[PDB]
RNA sequence: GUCCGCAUGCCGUAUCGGGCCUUGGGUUCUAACCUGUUCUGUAGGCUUAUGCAGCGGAC
RNA sequence: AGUGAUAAACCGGACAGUAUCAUGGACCGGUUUUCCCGGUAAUCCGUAUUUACAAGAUUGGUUUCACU
DNA sequence: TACCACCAAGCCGCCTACAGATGAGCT
DNA sequence: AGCTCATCTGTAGGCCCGATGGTGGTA
DNA sequence: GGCCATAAGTCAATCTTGTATTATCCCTC
DNA sequence: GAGGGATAATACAAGATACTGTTATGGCC
């Protein structure tokens, strides 16, 4: 088994093979479809038919080659970049260059032996992309709302026109998301179970499903809550902001309007916890119950809480 | 002469009068048209005819009251908020650094006697409003344009549609600005003089007018350079202390923002610009340091030309 | 007919800025020397300046001679805390810092703020403080070498031991020098005896307190003295003499632990639910206030009042 | 066959964690005493642990005796830079319970990395470094008092003058004690003579350099000794976009880095080979202190070079 | 009711330190070239939230 | 200490933002310092958007409960 | 009358000015 | 043998630990 | 079956990669 | 003569004040 490290850039790839005997092989490639073919050819050139490849999450510049090597039939791992930086410091490295990083990643692979990566389902990729687009347009719509507060009279026609455009466009995406989840019989069913939870509506169901996916990729619900950066360490905040920000207003709706939510708020209030500390706790709980309900395959039963 | 201070908020006003004798008269008001009428009456109630009012520039909530008192005929000073905080710290070592109350503003007014404020011409306000809007739409366009780079294919129809809208809207505002400056013969002429400067185009001239204004508010061109936050901040003391000169940045950000690309166009493509670039480069100045220097020069020539009242002359450089 | 004068000070040079009643400025630079200081007094009297308020920032000890020179000439002198000067320059909206700008900034500070006048301290006050701060300097150095013995290699120990002996001997020499100083003067002898009467204050703390309070009662209220040490909260401000605050911590600790009036104070705050160091912080402030109080009363400490 | 052991050391206690080949752990705490260390060795020999690789943090003087003990017992001992330990913890997960490193973590550090073996210094190497470090302490105290002389009150001056005389005498005594140490050892005498042959390196710097280089040549290349002193430039590059500015890394012994500044200033100013080097970089757009930083690195590298070569400084090579 | 006097209550997390560890990247390849801003120090200044409560005195 | 179970309990302060304010040090002519008066589109002192923007990554600690 | 162990727990200042080191060539 | 002068904006990471003074109690 | 008001409000995740602005010159229909 | 593309610059640090929106549910028409 060889151990390969790839540093990624927009234009180039730096590759570092670490052979069983211990010697290295290094080569640069263009980060293109042609270059990716040159890479696989080069590996099979040196009779490397079994290898574990390690690569940092670097924008979306690492995604094409990761899929290419997965299809060629290698074990690919796409590591969190923060681990890589810490590992470099554990190795005592005194420089940051592309060839240094590529070699560092081969060692990371060998020593740590990280979990294998799997390309998401096309529908999961599509759903995620729409949910991310929807958040962007909501942010822009909120920016333009803030402006109406202090807008001059001459500025106001321009702002009103943009708000109309943004509202139509948000409405269009919400339909595109609905059509996506309705077509797939799995997603249609899984979304309806999420919405059974009091506090989770149309919007929050789409975001949860976009990050949970189709299959059960988490073994336990507490892992999903960790993935969202909601577990304490203060909250770690080591997880997707898009997922975490989506849960805040549902947390308020639950703690206030819903029966099971109030119960949680009251118990924590009795122990002496402040407003946002309870909301923090409820965010984590919603995440954890969301993954719970899906595993069960059964509508939200309030009796358990 | 009385010295009044007004601490402003969205909803409420807080007023503190300082009498010549030294006694105070304080009263809170609503921040409404009705509220502002009570204030003027309450001052004229206590036979306060001549006063110097000092308000701090918190935003658009304090503009109506400032205009109200200016019309009532009092002297109004609208002060930079950072001066207020600094003044409080000059008044003692153990002062609260999260408040400047109406009393503090009355003392500020007495000690410093700040320069009088003047309500901008309706035409100047309109121009500044459109220019500020244009910059906001430019920023939103840049955001969406950055997103095209890495966008997923399902996202691209949405982003493309938004870019078309934003481009059309930007083009509408540009025409709306042009129509404003053309309809006033003072602005039409002043804008033509600015655009005679190599490196100043349609977009930059509109910014420069919005801040320079109709009248000549500044006595000297160097003051306008300071106003934009472009002059180098010297830091020297005795023999030991020798800090490095840097751009002060203590000035209007929207001006400072507008001049960086003009500066880069001047030093690269124009004769008078390259001349300046070469001299500083010889003297050992780095690339972006020369841009900073050219930004200040453009500001200072912009004001100079308008004073001179004649097109840009290269012979002066 | 009062002029306003600002002086920015350096090791070598002075930068003077006279602001006249009519509102115009006169400026000149002088050497920071005895000869230079005489030229300044002459230059002022050559412009017919008899009355003037002079403002100068505390800048090491490089401004102490000129401040004394002008005070003798009959001018009003203010020595301002330089943190105030900086804030004022910001309030004035200045965009540069030079020796010429600062001299002009200080003349305006003088005109606008009209700060309190400065009084040159008594030679005895000036000597007592000199000895006390030197004593702390040696204590800090002794503590350094004492830390070193913990982890010292064997070959280093003869050197460290030798230094500890020398420092201990020197510390006794100063303690005697301080005792001799506050025995010759009848006023200091009485006042030092009054301070020691407080349970929690001994030989060392008494001399520190006497150095900062001084001979004459230059504070109006007790909390003013507590603020001068930086003990009043705002969480403690720290905006005061660190050498004075330093000196009260261990006195505070022995007071709350092994005195009647201290334990009484500790218990009161313990009942209301305060942490250990919060009570010490509180006792430091209280010790400062009582110390000042006892002196103004002029009678030994009485526990009844607390 | 090989076990991996981590030890977490405090002043009073030792926490030990043995990682067995199979994967199970053994844990037992000990006193940080001579009795404790003998108990530890017996406990390992109890469980038939003959070959092991122990990993300890370099926290100071409290961990040195147990390291000595285990080295003599015949185990492989590694004494790691604590900053590596903290970084290793963060490489194991994103949301660890604590940032603290424990004996278990150290045993895992040992397994994954197999760090280089530690070697107990020679008594004379230990003596020399101790004296040199004492000399730097007294120099700093002497500097303090010199600064005070400037702005002292006249009543304070008798005390400051007295202390200065004492410190001057003690520095002089301790310099002679260093000279007597190196003169008595024929190896150290020769190596010190070689270092002084370099223009820019005198008595004070040669002693510092020996204290960190030592009797035997531990570094494979001279550039590694420059890295050891923290004198090499740290590059920061990625892709087209990311491009930081190279600065002195400073990841290394401050004592070395402190010692070489004035030699570098003497070399670039007064010596033939150092003026040559100054002039070349000054021909490029390099500032004074930038050139000084470069010369500091060069002196470290040449110092180690000359010792390895075993022959006095040859100017021809520069 | 008002104005002063407080060694009063409420508010208060001091300050100085010490020791130890550190085996670059690229190149024309290791005492060469490109890439390099040391280690620390010193002195001085600091006048209430009397804000609110108590308590005492005067009118 | 390891393994399994967990929609329970203890630990938990989310994101995104918006608007607005800013009159150099000095130099060149008079006076013969500055100030003041007159002049400054020149020279020396300058690392923009006082947080420029975009994208991607993130599989808890512990307590109960079983088994070794 | 002189000597000794103990209290608290490691969690945060703002400014205005200053200075030293070592080694090689020159007196 | 003693003296002078060469450098000026600021910015590595971690882990282990100790002393101060004054008083009541003890010898 | 459709529309509005309300709940919280002091302060602090880590990294790996990218790109825009305006105005004048220059080349192409 | 109008329309569109290419181009210049790169280590980062260092002022204040006033404010607002998100979603999902149980209430109301
Ligand atoms: Mg990378
Ligand atoms: Mg000064």
Residue numbers in the entry:
A (entry chain C): 5 to 237, 250 to 321
B (entry chain D): 5 to 321
C (entry chain A): 4 to 237, 250 to 321
D (entry chain B): 4 to 321
Published text:
In the third bRNA variant (pre-HSB), we mutated the HSGs of each binding loop to base pair with their cognate DNA before strand exchange (that is, TBL–tDNA and DBL–dDNA cognate base pairs). The pre-HSB bRNA mediated robust cleavage of the top strands of tDNA and dDNA, but did not lead to productive in vitro recombination. To understand how the pre-HSB bRNA precludes recombination, we determined the cryo-EM structure of the synaptic complex with the pre-HSB bRNA. The structure is similar to our original structure, with the top strands of tDNA and dDNA cleaved to form 5′-phosphoserine intermediates. However, in contrast to the original structure, the HSGs in the TBL and DBL form the expected base pairs with the tDNA and dDNA, respectively, thereby impeding top-strand exchange. Thus, our biochemical and structural observations indicate that the cognate base pairing with the HSGs traps the IS621 synaptic complex in the pre-strand exchange ‘locked’ state and does not allow recombination to proceed.
